[PDB]
Structures are given as structure tokens and as C-alpha cells.
């Protein structure tokens, strides 16, 4: 199959290998207590956390002294989060490879160097969110992504992960974000292209898809993110990247064709845009 090299980054179960909507693909112990931890190897472009029971942004620093704080790192001296791209590179000026590393990888590694709650030898590494409008790297103290159930969130934190135009310039980063994600991770939606399966030397349509109405490319990406692999309901729950991570958006018919099988070839249809749950909800190439 000639598309093997090209379509490799769309084998999300391999390049990413963890939940997308909720990323809790690994476990780690901090001070003797085991906690769940984001482990996806690819950045989740456009993903953010919405706090529905408070007027607080999830990148606000956690409270220190509750509902008035967010999911971000507590203030520190010297300050570690939030740190701009320029601040990060001068903070690691001595290291050679920080010059090479890009914004997202540097932000992920900067968060990984934060010692979790004075546990020098803990596997835990805080996840990070990078803003490309402010060029700020936000280290997330709270690695949780969703707590929204009728048990105690029908009437009030209560929060959910989602794609939003507000989160347009955000990139959710786990500790395992690879430094070569530009080549092995999906970021941009493919214009005039449609995912398909390569069978018997031909690129055919995805055999079975779920068709949902979608008014634009952004909504189709939001739908795909909602139905994508997650490591939380609503090791048994760990998706390992298995899920409805791909969608073919038909612009003319305003349909969002979502499927749970890794695509292996592309089809040229000028009315279609190929999107993945990890892809940026707006950018195109």
C-alpha cells in the first residue's frame, strides 16, 4: 500500500496510544498513593476543560489559602507556571536540546521536571496546556479532565473536556508528548480529501460510518472529540487509543461521518475534509 508512510500518523492507536477526550492511560504513585495520569503521546489540539459550576478558567492557578481557583500550577518562587516560550528557553539556556525542541515538546518537558509534591522518585509528571496566542506554557496541577455526573453535579468542581473556539489556540500535552510529533501526529485537517480503507489495491469508502449533521468543520471535529477514545466512563477503562477518532466531514451535505477503524488511504473529494480527534478543529492544509 503506497499510503503506508503517509497514513502512519493517522494510526492513532499507535502514535498516540491513549485516550483523547479523557487521557488517563497510565498510573503513578506519589507519596505512596496511586493516581491516574495522562499518557497520550500526541498533542490534543484545541482541547480544554470547561468548569460548568464556576466562573473560573481551568488555566487559573489552583487555590492556595477552592472554587476561585483552576486546574493550573500553584504560584512558585522561582515561578514555573505559567511560563512563556521565551522564558522557558532562557530558563533552560544551558541545555543543548532545548534550542532544538519546539513549543509543545518544550512545554511538556518543562512540566515533567516539576517534582510532584516533594516526591523525588515519583513516576508522576504533571500534564501541561500551551497557549499559542500568549505563547504561555501552563502546567496543570489537576490532571483530571471530567467530573460530571448526576450523583452530585446535577445541582451544585464539576467539569468536562471539550473542543471550543475559546480553546482554539490551546494544546493539551501529556508527559509522553514525543519531540517528533510534527511528523507522526495529526494536527491539520486535510482539504479536498476523505479517509478510506485500502482493499485489493484500491482505496474504498469506510465500510460503515455513523453520519451526524454538522454545520461546519469545527463542529465535526467537536463531535469526533466527544465520541473519541477516552480512559474514563461517561485498566478496564483504558482505551489505548481505540475509539471513534476519525471523521469525514462533507461540507456540501453538512454531514460528519465518524468511524472507529484506522484509515489506511485517502480519497480526493473536493467536498470533504478529513479530521481526527487530535487534529486542530480549524487549521487546514
Amino acid at each position, epitope marked *: 500500500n503506497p499510503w503506508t508512510e503517509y497514513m502512519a500518523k493517522y494510526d492513532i492507536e499507535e502514535v498516540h496510544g491513549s485516550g483523547i477526550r479523557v487521557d488517563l492511560g497510565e498510573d503513578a504513585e506519589v507519596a505512596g498513593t496511586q493516581y491516574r495520569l495522562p499518557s497520550g503521546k500526541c498533542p490534543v489540539f484545541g482541547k480544554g476543560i*470547561i468548569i*460548568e459550576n464556576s*466562573n473560573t478558567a481551568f488555566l487559573t492557578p489552583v487555590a492556595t489559602g477552592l472554587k476561585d481557583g483552576g486546574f493550573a500550577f500553584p504560584p512558585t518562587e522561582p515561578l514555573m507556571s505559567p511560563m512563556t516560550l521565551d522564558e522557558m528557553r532562557h530558563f533552560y539556556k544551558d541545555n543543548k536540546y532545548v534550542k532544538n525542541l519546539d513549543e509543545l515538546t518544550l512545554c511538556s518537558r518543562h512540566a515533567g521536571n516539576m517534582i510532584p509534591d516533594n516526591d523525588k522518585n515519583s513516576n508522576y509528571k504533571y500534564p501541561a496546556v500551551y497557549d499559542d496566542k500568549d505563547k504561555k506554557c501552563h502546567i496543570l496541577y489537576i490532571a483530571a479532565q471530567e467530573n460530571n455526573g448526576p450523583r452530585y453535579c446535577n445541582k451544585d468542581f464539576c467539569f468536562r473536556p471539550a473542543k*471550543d*473556539i*475559546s*480553546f482554539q489556540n490551546y494544546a493539551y500535552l501529556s508527559k509522553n508528548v514525543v519531540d517528533n510529533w510534527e511528523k507522526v501526529c495529526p494536527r491539520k485537517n486535510l482539504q479536498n480529501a476523505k479517509f478510506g480503507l485500502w482493499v485489493d489495491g484500491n482505496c474504498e469508502d469506510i465500510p460503515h460510518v455513523n453520519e451526524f*449533521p*454538522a*454545520i461546519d468543520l469545527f*463542529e465535526c471535529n467537536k463531535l469526533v472529540f466527544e465520541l473519541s477514545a477516552s480512559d474514563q466512563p461517561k485498566d478496564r477503562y483504558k482505551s489505548h487509543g481505540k475509539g471513534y477518532n476519525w471523521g469525514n466531514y462533507n461540507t456540501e*451535505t*453538512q454531514k460528519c461521518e465518524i468511524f472507529n477503524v484506522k484509515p489506511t488511504c485517502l480519497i480526493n473529494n473536493a467536498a470533504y475534509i478529513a479530521t481526527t480527534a487530535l487534529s486542530h478543529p480549524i487549521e487546514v492544509e
Partner: antibody
Amino acid sequence: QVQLRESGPHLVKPSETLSLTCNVSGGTINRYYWNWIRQIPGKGLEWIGNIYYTGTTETNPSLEGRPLISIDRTTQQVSLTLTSVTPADTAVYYCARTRGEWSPDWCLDRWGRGTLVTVSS
Amino acid sequence: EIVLTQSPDTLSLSPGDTATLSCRASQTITNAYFAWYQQKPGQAPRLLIYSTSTRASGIPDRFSGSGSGTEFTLTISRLEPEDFAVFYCQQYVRSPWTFGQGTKVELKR
């Protein structure tokens, strides 16, 4: 049962700023899109702009970027800030809520009573 | 913007008659994003149908919407006094969302 109510001035001078507020009570502002609709006597209904509780807003280009929409989650009140007003802006302004979050449910199933605003010297 | 044109502008129908309202669009409209509204004097519009056929909550089955592409019609099966009002069509496929100029349905007596 969600009740939407508009509040604002009845008279605004030309070139002034028209500020209107929509007090959302009886239901959440989350997962819903909040609109400002205007019907001028002589024309039909006109759409002004949107706002989601995340902060995202879309406006009508016909208004030439004059309308600014904001939302206060703590007070659950949606505001309209229309600048450089003109007598042609004289009309009845409603705030309407979409049936849901997803695009097919963007029909307006919840409406306020509407408040009349006159623009004149 | 997408232009919606309704016809006829006025109707005088006795109770029990059938009213047919038509709405034409300047460009094709997906069925999922078409709606009809009812407005009484001194009151805000009330949603009747969305997605071109789905009757809103509490709306009697006398109201029925249909159409495809650039043609859409609203039918009121057996008019009764509480139905007579002004009716508007709306599209929400492409911003700006637009309405028709409306149809006034008078009660013939």
C-alpha cells in the same frame, strides 16, 4: 422553567452606545447559545449576534462590527453593547435561546418579552 | 447572507380552512437547519417547527413543515382562532441567521 427578560433604556441618542441586558433565570446558561434578535417596524426579524457561555461570540456583518456581546456567568445575564447607534437601530430587541448546543438545535425555542428601544435626538 | 422570501403576504381564511405558507431561499438549505415561527401582536415569536419537519414541544399536529433545497412550505391543517397570527421562516445554515418577511393570516368572519 427558564425565563428570559430584557432590560435597557427606551431612549438613546444617536452616536451613543446602546446597552441591553438579558437576565436568564430558571435555568442554566451552560450548553446553550444566546442570541439578540431585533425586528424594525417596517422590516422583519433580524439576527444581531450569538454568545456561548465559554465566551465565544458571532455577530451579523450587516451591523458593521458595532454590536458587542458579553456574558456574565456569575449573574447569568447576557449583555448587548451596540455602538454608534442610528435612528435606523430603533426597534424591539429580544434575547432568544437555542433549543440546544448542537447545530440542528440552534432554532430559537426560548424568547424574552422584548423591550422597545428608540434612537432619536 | 441567505435571503428568505415568503408568500403570500396576507391570508383571510375562516376557521377550519387550510393555510399553505411558502418560503423560498436564495441558496440550498440543509433540512436540519430550517424552522418556522408564530408571532402574535404584542408578543415574541414562538417556535413551531425546526429541522424543517420536527414539531416543537406542545405544538398541535395541525402544523406541518416540509421542503428541500430552496423550497419550503408550512401547512396548518384545520385553522382555529388561536392559530391566526403572523408566521416567519428561518434558516440557520450560514451566519447571519435570517428570517422571512412574514405572512399575516387573518381570520375571515
